[PDB]
Design goal:
Keywords: ribosome, giardia, parasite
Bound molecules: potassium ion, magnesium ion
Strand order of the largest sheet of chain D: 2-4-3-1-5
Structural class of chain D: alpha+beta
Strand order of the largest sheet of chain C: 2-3-5-6-9
Chains: A alpha+beta (about 60), B alpha+beta (about 375), C mainly beta (about 140), D alpha+beta (about 90)
Oligomer: part of a larger assembly
Number of helices of chain C: 2
Distance between the termini of chain C: 35 Å
Radius of gyration of chain D: 13 Å
Structural class of chain C: mainly beta
Largest sheet of chain D: 5 strands, mixed
PDB class: ribosome
Entry title: Cryo-EM structure of large subunit of Giardia lamblia ribosome at 2.7 A resolution
Organism of A: Giardia lamblia ATCC 50803
Strand content of chain D: 25-35%
Distance between the termini of chain D: 6 Å
Order of helices and strands of chain D: EHHEHEEE
Radius of gyration of chain C: 14 Å
Number of helices of chain D: 3
Number of strands of chain D: 5
Chain A: Ribosomal protein L24A
Helix content of chain D: 25-40%
Strand content of chain C: 25-35%
Amino acid sequence: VTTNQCSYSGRKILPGYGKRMSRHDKVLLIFLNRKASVHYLNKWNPRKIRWTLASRRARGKEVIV
Amino acid sequence: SHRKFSCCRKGNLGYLPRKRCTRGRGRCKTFPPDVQGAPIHLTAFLGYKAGCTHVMRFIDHRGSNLHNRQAIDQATIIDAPPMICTAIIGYAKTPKGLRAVTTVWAAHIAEPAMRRFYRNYFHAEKTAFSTYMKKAADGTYIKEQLGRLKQHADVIRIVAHTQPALTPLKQKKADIMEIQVNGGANVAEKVDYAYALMEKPISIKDVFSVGAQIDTISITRGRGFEGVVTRWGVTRLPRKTRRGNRKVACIGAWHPANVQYTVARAGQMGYFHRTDTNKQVFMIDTAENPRCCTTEFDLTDKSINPVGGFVNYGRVQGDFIMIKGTCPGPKRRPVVMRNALLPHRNCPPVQLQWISTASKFGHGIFETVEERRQFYAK
Amino acid sequence: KRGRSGGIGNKFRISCGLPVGAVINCADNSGAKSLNMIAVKNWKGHLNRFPKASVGDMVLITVGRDGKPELRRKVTPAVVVRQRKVWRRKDGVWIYFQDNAGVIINPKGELKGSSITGPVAKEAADRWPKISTTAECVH
Amino acid sequence: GIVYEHTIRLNKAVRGKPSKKAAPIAIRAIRAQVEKLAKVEDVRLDPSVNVFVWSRGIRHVPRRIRLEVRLEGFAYVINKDVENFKHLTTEKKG
RNA sequence: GGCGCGGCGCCCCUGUACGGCGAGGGCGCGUUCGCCCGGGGGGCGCGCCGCGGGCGCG
RNA sequence: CAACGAGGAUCCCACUGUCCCGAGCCGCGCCUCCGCGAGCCUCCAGCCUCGGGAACGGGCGAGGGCCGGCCAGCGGGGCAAG
RNA sequence: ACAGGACUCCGGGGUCAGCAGCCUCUAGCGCGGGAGCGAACGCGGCUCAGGGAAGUCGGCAAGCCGGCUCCGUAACCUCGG
Ligand SMILES: [K+]
Ligand SMILES: [K+]
Ligand SMILES: [K+]
Ligand SMILES: [K+]
Ligand SMILES: [K+]
Ligand SMILES: [K+]
Ligand SMILES: [K+]
Ligand SMILES: [K+]
Ligand SMILES: [K+]
Ligand SMILES: [K+]
Ligand SMILES: [K+]
Ligand SMILES: [K+]
Ligand SMILES: [K+]
Ligand SMILES: [K+]
Ligand SMILES: [K+]
Ligand SMILES: [K+]
Ligand SMILES: [K+]
Ligand SMILES: [K+]
Ligand SMILES: [K+]
Ligand SMILES: [K+]
Ligand SMILES: [K+]
Ligand SMILES: [K+]
Ligand SMILES: [Mg+2]
Ligand SMILES: [Mg+2]
Ligand SMILES: [Mg+2]
Ligand SMILES: [Mg+2]
Ligand SMILES: [Mg+2]
Ligand SMILES: [Mg+2]
Ligand SMILES: [Mg+2]
Ligand SMILES: [Mg+2]
Ligand SMILES: [Mg+2]
Ligand SMILES: [Mg+2]
Ligand SMILES: [Mg+2]
Ligand SMILES: [Mg+2]
């Protein structure tokens, strides 16, 4: 089906889930759940949150193409 | 003096009294009207509420702002194992309404039907239909007893029961219900059709069709004893009221010197008999078909049961039906489904592109157990 | 001839985030800084209920003390183009913005500015063609 | 006589009750669960059970306890000390 | 309505356990870091099984 | 008239369940049970509509309703009590 | 007969500006009784999207602020603030 990738983590989002946010520099952000949206607003660094795509990439556990 | 500003009353007086329902289950009080000449068909079925999901569908409307676009809609899932027809009843239209002629039962009656006749089954002495089975053994008695319904009745119904050993429920006794035979050419053709269904199973795909509308009848969620703010929706009083602000302040004028039945009072909320009408059918399938919930838009094989299982219901084993929207009751209430008495006229067709099978226990993100395994592949 | 009211077509209902008394930001370059919302058009009310508006609705405003002197002391029509209350579209998308904003525009649909800053919603761009043409981003 | 071994989940038995009386209510639930298990009407507990149930105050009682019921004469319960409860079930002997 | 108790699987929630071993501003000491480790803990939803589950009153 | 005030007023910023419009949760009462166990008040009684009447009746004239016995709540009436 | 009233003496440790608040060694241990359930409604508390006094006679009630160090401080004045 048509899918999106969470902008905070790297997960896939299925039709009818999560919510979007329109930033004022004219950039859109797509969130998987409310947990992911609270992490972004508080300015918690994605690489320090160990379950994200960004963390596992920085830890060698995720292969970067 | 006159009430200074204008404002309607709160709540609908046509759903009074707000008492607990005393009927056992939802009871179908009306049937769709018979049309002399129409093809014969059944009008009702009985299922159990399994769960909710949402779907993607392509809208084909005309003049609508969604004319050639995609919409996401909520659907409800109802579990419908086949019912067994066990008896035939006829009625006559008389100057006192509907009066019955006789009820003709089948020769051989199953355990789920026999348990509904007893309070405790293990302990009881079993003397239901003990004489009837002996007499009715030879099939001649049925033919003679059907020789009356052909001669005196205007309306024919079949008696049918569910099979609760094909569900995740706890009960072992069936739910018994009359189903009216509409259509046909005359009365005598509707009794040849009812006899050809005796002791046989009936599937829900042979009553309802896709895109038609139905009515759902059930008993609502219960909340027990509840005050006026929640029971009736009246305004909450200001903060510095001495003895509490969850009340109606004035419950009547001095005259008349009684409390009127139109005033909001506290009491039982929920567990009511209700009817929600005009529900469109989305899909009729079976859970044994492993391709039941797969559009082309996905390539894996998906079926009706979600990852994790239907929360607070259990597993679905056979046939099911899918209606748009919502219906009364919690999970596992029996729901009666009939044809729509006065259906909505401008409803578009049904064209499904995607169905959600992700987990409803929590916030599941995997359509199938197989691809969750590929995700955590170590 | 020449009638041409404001608002092209029909709209589905969405969540209204702004009731009477709210103060929102000015998104065009007319000169105003904040707009005080005092009424909503097409509003039949009910007892005790505040009037409320969402993106795409036409509202009546007054220009606050930080805005230009000529624009002040008058009841001015405007359209809301961004809101913070999250709303659901028909295709199942939930979306919200970072701030609350509007533009000054007469019921014939002609703007009082030359620009709009930041993104605007699709709700406001479909009803008001002039907004769709001078906007730089539509979400 | 016969000797049982059984675990009782204690966090589940204080569900729905005020936490200010969790340990007293756990004591009253061990007796009710033992009496059914051993088919008796008189449950003498050992103070080893009392010390374990109360070991974290009146509110936060331990999640699980492992018992040992000796069917005598009544039933006599003492506390059995284990490191973990991974796949432990009912053990009846005698 | 022969209950339930207690397990094992699935699925979810939190966010990577104690420990062992090898980076750390500095002066054997050392906050913290990396690896074993989407780990450990938990469950009131779903699926299947050790102890058990049909008195007395009218 | 500077300083001062649990003194009377109007406005603004900030703040908020005051409000739009309400929702969920905690403890203790209430509620059910074992033990204990009172006050106030009482012509007689205790379902309504109209008429007449000390001009607004539970009883009187005429009509309409209604086995009997109880609980959790409630504040229209008893021109309720003090 | 009783959450009221009823003078004085002796006064450890930790945190801290401290005889404040919060935890504690020594010493002392009642308070017209218990169990079950987890309705309305009350009494004492907690949290609430978007808006922010539109509520009300009236910002009543609640909330915001707050320790220490450094920076920076107007009108007016009886020259002390
Ligand atoms: K009035
Ligand atoms: K009035
Ligand atoms: K009210
Ligand atoms: K009244
Ligand atoms: K009433
Ligand atoms: K009322
Ligand atoms: K009431
Ligand atoms: K109804
Ligand atoms: K908003
Ligand atoms: K002075
Ligand atoms: K003073
Ligand atoms: K004074
Ligand atoms: K004063
Ligand atoms: K509430
Ligand atoms: K009169
Ligand atoms: K009269
Ligand atoms: K009188
Ligand atoms: K009166
Ligand atoms: K209760
Ligand atoms: K009440
Ligand atoms: K005000
Ligand atoms: K105050
Ligand atoms: Mg008061
Ligand atoms: Mg008072
Ligand atoms: Mg869920
Ligand atoms: Mg009002
Ligand atoms: Mg680690
Ligand atoms: Mg609300
Ligand atoms: Mg009287
Ligand atoms: Mg009389
Ligand atoms: Mg009264
Ligand atoms: Mg709020
Ligand atoms: Mg006002
Ligand atoms: Mg007002």
